[PDB]
Amino acid sequence: AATQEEIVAGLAEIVNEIAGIPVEDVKLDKSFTDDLDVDSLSMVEVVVAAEERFDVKIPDDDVKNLKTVGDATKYILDHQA
């Protein structure tokens, strides 16, 4: 559905409405609850929306097992079509 940069870009669309980050900020050298506004519990609202956005399905387990957006993209961009 999107490539690495586009995954990140798509993520940021939701992270902008949830927390409020600049959609020019969230690039590959970012992490969610580290380099973002830290939605924290609200990040679950991000990921659930992101699943459908990128044609993936991310288990609650994997969500907390991933780290950066460069790391998260690995699971996403690979599992999607």
- In the chain, what are the domain boundaries? 1-81
Helices (H) and strands (E) in the chain, counts: 5, 0
From residue 48, how far is each of 57, 58, 61, 70 by CA, in Å?
8, 8, 13, 18
The contacts of residue 53 (CB under 8 Å, 6+ apart) are: 1, 10, 13, 14
Sign of CA dihedral 32, 33, 34, 35: positive
Options 34, 35, 37, 39, the catalytic residue:
39
Q: How was this structure determined?
A: NMR
Q: What is the CATH number of domain 1-81?
A: 1.10.1200.10
DSSP 28: S
The contacts of residue 65 (CB under 8 Å, 6+ apart) are: none
Q: Is 34 a catalytic residue?
A: no
